[PDB]
Subunit: 152 residues, 3 copies
Amino acid sequence: PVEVTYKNMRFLITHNPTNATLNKFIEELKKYGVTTIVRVCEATYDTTLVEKEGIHVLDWPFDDGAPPSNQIVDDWLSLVKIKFREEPGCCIAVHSVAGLGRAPVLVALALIEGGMKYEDAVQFIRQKRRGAFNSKQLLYLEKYRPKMRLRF
Amino acid sequence: PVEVTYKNMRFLITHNPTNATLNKFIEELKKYGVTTIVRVCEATYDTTLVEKEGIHVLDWPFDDGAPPSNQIVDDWLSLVKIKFREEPGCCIAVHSVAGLGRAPVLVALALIEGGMKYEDAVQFIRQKRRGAFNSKQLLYLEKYRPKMRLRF
Amino acid sequence: PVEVTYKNMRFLITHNPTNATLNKFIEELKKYGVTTIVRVCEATYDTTLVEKEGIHVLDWPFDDGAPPSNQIVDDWLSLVKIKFREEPGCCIAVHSVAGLGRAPVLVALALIEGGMKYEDAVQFIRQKRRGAFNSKQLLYLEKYRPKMRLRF
């Protein structure tokens, strides 16, 4: 369970919780300023216990091996743009099952879209999630084309 | 006990030592290039054993919950400006009792005053001191207005 | 065994392996994207088992206490310039016996040559290799004069 940081952003990647992890998974989150968690992998637990905790749970699962939607990209970006400004020094926990694939991509995106070449972003994430990213994923980031409409 | 880094600065936040910690607390420090330690919380031990070690101990304690002086700010800034230039790659250990409040503020300051929006600085510190900073503290950083007279 | 990161670069400093470490030292490397390892300290093991692993082993040992060649500097720079572009998000493991001396210098170089004042680079490395660098080494970095021909 590692967290990154760029500019005013602070993402936390996580180990997909069980259904018995929760109460302590939320205690953990609760103490990371994580006011939002974007599920990317298939949901494997309630979100009521979470929601009833103040943590907003947005889940947009997608085929592990399939480039992360086209739409999702925009909700992420649109979400990211805001929050970090809405609540300064907060945090977005993005988690997938393994958290070395889709979870990083998402994060690796905001880090691009918000400046930083993709290489600088892959190195940056691997710096804190050794092994993260695979041939496909990489290929896809390389091919990603940012709008770069992010001003800080 | 975590250390940060920005530009040519390298701050180390610490767990307020006991009076039995010292000898090993200084061994630890001694091996961080820390040639100075600014006490922010109430002093709870001698400084002779420290001073007699080459580590300069400046202590400017202040009410935990009270914005860190107005003067202190300038001694910090004035101190920080220098040292990191005086002895390159050295270090300033700032410590308070908890080290999640005043200690960070001080540090979080130099990181502002030396560039970097405050959000970028809160995220940066929390990246390495999860939970650090509270409603008040934050509010105060937000309201801090830098001179920005720091050239690197 | 720590790794750093600047721009598109990702260096990993390592504990000089034994001759019984290998198989697991390569398993470790293998999982850091390290496709190259520049030996700076005297070689104390084969490189066949390594080479036969896809990891390119360049070794340019030099007197521990003697500024790192004059030529070596250029092979490093010339090597560094490339690879990180050749294979994005890869890694170069530089290792010496202690890995708090020559190994850092090498790394501390690319970080200079690729921008960043030397102070910013010493602090940056010590941030992740506390104690790294000595009076001499430092003196030498300070006196290093970059070409700064690195564009990212």
